[PDB]
Every structure is written in C-alpha cells, then in structure tokens.
Symmetry: C3
Subunit: 316 residues, 3 copies
C-alpha cells in the first residue's frame, strides 16, 4: 500500500538525566523520533519540514532505495541538504524487511551522536519467522551517548576531543528510564539499536536471549547469548522467554556506561519486572511513575503508520 | 549435588605490573576471585562475609536464578547491599551450563572495573560436545583494565573521565603474566572473559581457534577465527589444536592495550610454549618462574567446589 | 610454486588528510604496504631490508608458520629485531587460505597503530567458494586511525594518553579517499581489515553485505549485514551484488570516526558509484582525480606476485 507521513524537525530540549537537560533536533519534537511501522512492499512517502535553524536530511538506514537512490538522504551525494525552513519529500518502496532506522546524515557526528536525530523504522515481513509468530510483546531499545559540555549549544560535539559522560536507552539515563513490565509466559522480542556513537554490551539478568536477526535480517543460525554487543549502526533482534518471574535488571555491561556525569548508578539500565512479584520496601522503582510505551511496545501494536509518543517529546 | 562454601571480601593489594600495585576488593583476598567449578544441576550455597569498609553484593552472571531471583545479587533490585562487616548467603541451582562468572553489583564501574571483584564460575554440562571430550587442558583468561591514577584510592575510578592505562589477563600485565605451556597433540580449551570495562581482540599466533561457545552456550555453527573480540560481560570458548610446535605469542591485538603506563610492551600477552622447543638466550621468558595454575588449569582438574590460588592472593 | 619477494622498510611522509601529513615506516615506501598475492601451498620467501633508523620485524598474521615458527616475526620470541640497515629473510608455506595480512611486530602500539607498518596478504584457496567464483571485483579496505600530535615524531604515539583524531581507509581520510566504481551486474568482494587500533562499523548504503569469511576462513553459516564491525586484527570478507544503481555512500558508522581534526566530514568514507548514473553538478566527487586501484582492485587481477602502488606512496626526506 501507499503510506504517506508528514514529519517536522524541531529545536527542543529534553531531559536525559537528573542533572542533564539537552538541546536536540527532534523529529516531530521528540527523541526517539516517531515510530514508523510499515509492511514489506509498501510505498512510503515522507514529507519533511525543517523547523530548525540548521540544514538536515533524513537517511533511511537499511532501506535499499531500489530505483530511488535520490531519496537516500546523503547531502552532497544524493541530494542537497534540506535548509532551514524548507521542506523535502522522500519516496521509497519498503522492500527490505525487519528492524531498520532513520537518522540525519548532515553533520552526523553531532546531529546523530548527541542531537537525537534518529528513530525506528519497522518493516513487517509479509512472511515472518515462526519464532516471530509466538511473540506477545515487541520492544525497541535505542542506545546513545551524550556530551554534557555541549548540551545547550548546537554546533559542537561528537568529536574524539569531547567527553561522552552520559549514556541512555531511548534518550533517558537510569533512574529516568522505565521498567520492562512482563507477565509469566510472555514471548518478548527486543530490538537493539546502536543509534549513537558508542558500543553497548546489553546483558539480561535472569534470562538468555535468542539472537534471531542481524540488522533486521533473520539468521540462518540463531544463537543464544546473555550479553549482546551493539555498535554504531547495528541492530540485533532477540527473543526472551518470560518464564522466570522476579525483578531482573537489564543493562549495558560496559562499566563506564553505568554512570552519569561521573556518578553511579546511571545509564542504559532497565528492569524486567514480572507482574505479581511483591514489591519490596527498598525497591528502587517502588511507586514508579510508569510509562507502558517507553519502549514503543504499545505503539507497536497499533498497525501501520507513524506514531508519536508524548513521553519522548521535548520542550520548546 | 549440594555444594556449599564460604567466601569473604577483603581489602588487599595486588601487583598488576612492574611498578603498579593496586588496592582491590578481593574475593578471598585474591584477584581473580576463587574458581567455582560445579556440575549442571548442582545446588549451590555461598556464604559471603564482607570484611571491607564498603558495601558489596555478588551477582552470578549467566545464572538464571530460576525461582531464586532474590539471589541475583543486585542492590536495590533483588537485595539490600551486604554492609561492611555483615554476611549474606546466596542459594541457587546451577541449571545453566558453561563458562559463567560472578562479580560485585554495587558501584560496578569501580568495583568490577578496577577493584578486581570478579571470578570464574564453570558449570560442566551433562552432555559436553564431543570436542570438549578431547580436551587435555582447560584455560581461563579473564581480561580487565586498570587506571593507575586511582590505584591507591578506593571509592574513585571507572568513569569516562579516568584513563585506563594498564591492561591484563588474570590481573597481570606482561611480563608478569605466565606462559601457556602445552605439548604437541594437546587439545586446549580456552575460555575468554570480558571481566573489566574494556574490549579485547584476542589473537593466537601460529594457530586458528575454533569458536565453540558464546556466553557458555554451544554454537550450532561454530567458526574458526585467529582473532576473537571479547567485550564487557561476554565469554567466548575456543579450541586450539596444539599441533604446531614453536613459541607463539597470544595477545590482545588492540594496539593501545599492549602498553603499561605508556611503555611497550605490556598488557594481555602470553606465549604458547611447546615442550621440547629449544630455548634461545634472547627469549624474553627463558628464565620464567613458572606458575602452572596461572590460568586455573590445574584447579580445573581437581573436582567440584571452590578453589583459591596463592598466586592470585593480595597483601593485607 | 616458490615465490620470492624483496621488500624494504623506508621512512616516508604520507598525506592522510587535507593538512595532515604523517611520518610513517612504509613497506616499500608506501602505506598500505604492497599487496602480496599467492596461491594456497606456495612457498613464500620474503627478503626484508630495513632502510629506517629503528628496528622492525614483519609478522605474518594468519600464517600458521607450520614448522617455521622462527619466521613468525616476533622480537624476543621468535627472533631478534631487524636493526637499522640490516636485512632478514622470512620463509613460510602459504598453507592457510584467505584474507591475511602482515605488519611490524616491534613497538606495535606505535608502528602498527600510527606508522602504517602493515599490508595485505591474499592467499587464493585451491577450492574457492562457489560465490567467490562469481566475483567480478575484489576490494581491499584496511582501516586505521591517526594521532595528529605525533605526526612528525617517530618514537611517540599509540598510547591511551594520545588522542586519535583522524581516521582512514587505506591511509586516506575523506575526501582524499577514492570512490568504489561499479556497474550493474558486478559482484563485489570486499575484504575489511582492522589494521589499526580502532573499531570500525562499516556500513554500505543501498545494499546488504553477505558476510562470507571471518579472518579469511569461510563461514559455514554466512549471514547478511548492512553494518559490519571490524576490530583490531580481524578481517571480514563480504559479497555485495551490485544490482541497485545509484551513488551510495559506504562508511564507518562510528560517529566520531567521520571527522578529521575535529571537523566533518572526513574519515573512512567512500561512495559506491554506479557507472550508469548521471553526475549532478553538486555531487561532492564530480571530476574526482580518480585512482582505480585505491582498493587494490586492479592489482588483484594481475596475477600472483607482489604489487606496489604509487597511489599509496609517500615522500622521502
Ligand atoms: Cl551501472
Ligand atoms: Cu541534522
Ligand atoms: Cu546509519
Ligand atoms: Cu545507511
Ligand atoms: Cu548485571
Ligand atoms: Cu563491591
Ligand atoms: Cu555481569
Ligand atoms: Cu548478569
Ligand atoms: Cu601478534
Ligand atoms: Cu616497526
Ligand atoms: Cu596481527
Ligand atoms: Cu598474528
Ligand atoms: Cu550512512
Ligand atoms: O553485570
Ligand atoms: O599482532
Ligand atoms: O549512517
Ligand atoms: O547510514
Ligand atoms: O551481570
Ligand atoms: O599478530
């Protein structure tokens, strides 16, 4: 089918960590950008309006651009950039299946590295794996890093001379991340994204992960892991059988990554929280103000389209 | 069978490199911590006493904690910390096979990152692979990194603002490591662990490695490699057929890691030494005071339980 | 067959990026070093003369040195170093197939990390994969990093204390790299090497890569990827079917790696340029002064032997 979406680029401020508000260029004013969910073979049309002060593009990572290379989104190579105030339309056929993503391709070290210019693009195979058939919950985790020294000033950041001192999943640092709430018997698909410039060793306590897809394509030889290394650009899809009730932390195992501005704990940390496990008095997330769509799992149930999430919106 | 043992946590000092003594929090006062070797299905009981001035826990990485999540060792999630001077008992069933490990889960960026709070946990499968049946020598290699500036300073370190300037295997930097001594026809299992916060590209001269396990689970499709990338939290098991006598260095190929405080050589370097190869007067290790258990290879031969090793003990 | 080569080690200066000239120890005065291309089972003889002021060796990474360990090239382990002005001869049988490489094994954090002491060693299998037979273009991409503070000073660099602020493929930083020119129907083998001390996430726009070999040995279970992580010492071989005409950038996806001295763009970036696509006036590489051998693809067609390339040569003092 033909699916047409309108996107903006906005200058907004987001709260990444306690102690760290960050100036970003949010797609539709949010970080992660809106979930785009379509079916294998669809014709996609995205009209982009640049409501910021600087030029951008959108590149569709993993999208072949079969017969549409002029929509690849690379300045100086497939198009001239989208300037401030201007608009531009992308058209492509979603013939590549799986977990894809989209991001700015202007000044990528800064725009993608620390200005949040990215979001998920999920293409459903017309014919999914048997394994995907059993899935009861779909989960998106986009990891990135932040440089506090340049949080308020567009135009700097993302070089080897900068210090990345805050780490996140879906643009929040623990304890501002949210738990992954499951019930016994759930079949959980988790899609990891190396959205920023760091490497993330994602480790699930209490469970092994079945690695089923690399960069959205199904592996002929899936393998189990308790720790999955995710590096810039990559995606890994895993399956977790939620058959082991408890509270099980789920986090980046890169030691410096579980800090925030030098202080521990912080970073890409969540907790697999099983329904019905009694909450202890000392539980860090006792009485959490809970967001069931922090990993886009509600949005992912709503069919094809473009989904904003107010939990990800920034302030003007 | 039920395996019960007693572990303490001690403030001790170890020598990591010539010129670098390091204050660590050693399990049973040693780094690497004691080897725990059990069989698949064993019931494990660990009585832990914190004889240090700071709180810790012990998390059993790879252990599912099926119906025992309260033994997962995560402060604020599965337990309150073990305070200075107190004791805590962990109980779990070793139903997950393979190369596992354990480490503190309090202040992990420092404690695991630079204070040595880790050790190996090997669970023997009921049904080993055929190649595992042929193994004549079993080898543990736990890689980590060190920040010389905080060598004397508990409560500091393991942040992006620190500099990791020393590198090791089993808490020694070359030349203070030990050779891997083999004889022609040996079948060598090597287990690599990403114990600290760094990434290590483990490369065997003179030989290809067959990669057989990821995080302790057997791959359906094992593959050969001469260089295996090991990142924090991960384990890789390989097999080397010792069929090429010579002296063949075996080391981290990450260029900066074969240094020690800016000097070369150092870091995670050993040498596969074959019996009967004549020794040149210029061979760097011709007069080595040899420790046959530097890779726990002897301990691994002595039954099921917990094993200390005097060569890893620190000074009070 | 017996194949004998004479190699030198020279002090030269290479241009890594606009405004970054770098002092290196180039094999045959070039970085990447010369392509060595032999057949499985050949007996290789390499006579090395050190024309620089410092000691070196050559280690043959991936070469088993079966019964020839004393040619492994490691100082203090298998030999004494090759001192300034001296020579040394390596002999080994190429019985290990695939994408191998060679590099100095003295002071490696500096010599391999920033002095360009490395080059590719390709061993053709007697029995290549079926897919390898469809290949119409073979491509070598050797990634490394550079520390500008020590560009002019042999004897320093390659430590945790240093800052790697420039990045390259085959020792050039975009825009001084060259495009990968194909035509529709091409079958492209690319061989990625982690020559330096950095990690590189190589991403092909417009195409998936079929990953077929790890460290030169064929995988029983090849897999597709659009992003392949390459870390020091490793090689990956992939296949790209060139069936999607466009201009498709191909680059290290590690964000800080697409910079040069703190500026963007730069780093390990090329463009897959399909012959049939009309060139726009704003295209960054319109009228590029083109080197068709930037990825050794012409040398790789020219038979067994050792091949220099002037596009990689630096300047003598
Ligand atoms: Cl064409
Ligand atoms: Cu942008
Ligand atoms: Cu991308
Ligand atoms: Cu892309
Ligand atoms: Cu953990
Ligand atoms: Cu601790
Ligand atoms: Cu762990
Ligand atoms: Cu764990
Ligand atoms: Cu080596
Ligand atoms: Cu050298
Ligand atoms: Cu090497
Ligand atoms: Cu080697
Ligand atoms: Cu790109
Ligand atoms: O952990
Ligand atoms: O090496
Ligand atoms: O990208
Ligand atoms: O990309
Ligand atoms: O863990
Ligand atoms: O090597």
């Amino acid at each position: 089918a033909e699916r047409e979406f309108d996107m903006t680029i906005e200058e907004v401020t987001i709260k990444v960590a306690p102690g760290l508000d960050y100036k970003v260029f949010g797609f539709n004013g949010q970080v992660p950008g809106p979930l785009i969910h379509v079916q294998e073979g669809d014709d996609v049309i995205v009209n982009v309006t640049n409501n910021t002060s600087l030029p951008h593009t959108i590149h569709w990572h993993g999208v072949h651009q079969k017969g549409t290379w002029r929509s690849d989104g690379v300045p100086g190579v497939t198009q001239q950039p989208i300037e401030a105030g201007d608009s531009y339309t992308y058209k492509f056929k979603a013939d590549r299946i799986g977990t894809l993503w989209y991001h700015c391709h202007v000044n990528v070290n800064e725009h993608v590295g620390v200005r949040g210019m990215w979001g998920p693009l999920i293409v459903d195979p017309k014919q999914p794996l048997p394994i995907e058939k059993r899935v009861t919950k779909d989960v998106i985790m986009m990891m990135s890093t932040w440089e506090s020294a340049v949080a308020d000033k567009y135009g700097e950041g993302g070089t080897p001379m900068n210090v990345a001192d805050y780490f996140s999943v879906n643009a929040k640092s623990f304890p501002l991340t949210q738990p992954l709430r499951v019930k016994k018997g759930d079949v959980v698909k988790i899609r990891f994204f190396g959205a920023g410039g760091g490497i993330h060793a994602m480790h699930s306590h209490g469970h092994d992960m079945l690695v089923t897809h690399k960069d959205g394509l199904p592996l002929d030889s899936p393998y189990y892991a308790d720790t999955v290394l995710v590096s810039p650009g990559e995606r890994y899809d895993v399956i977790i059988e939620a058959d082991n009730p408890g509270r099980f932390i789920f986090h980046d195992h890169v030691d410096t990554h579980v800090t925030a501005g030098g202080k521990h704990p912080g970073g890409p940390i969540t907790v697999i929280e099983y329904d019905g496990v009694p909450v202890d008095d000392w539980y860090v997330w006792k009485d959490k103000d809970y967001d069931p769509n922090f990993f886009y799992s509600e949005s992912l149930k709503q069919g094809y389209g473009m989904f904003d999430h107010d939990g990800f919106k920034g302030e003007f």
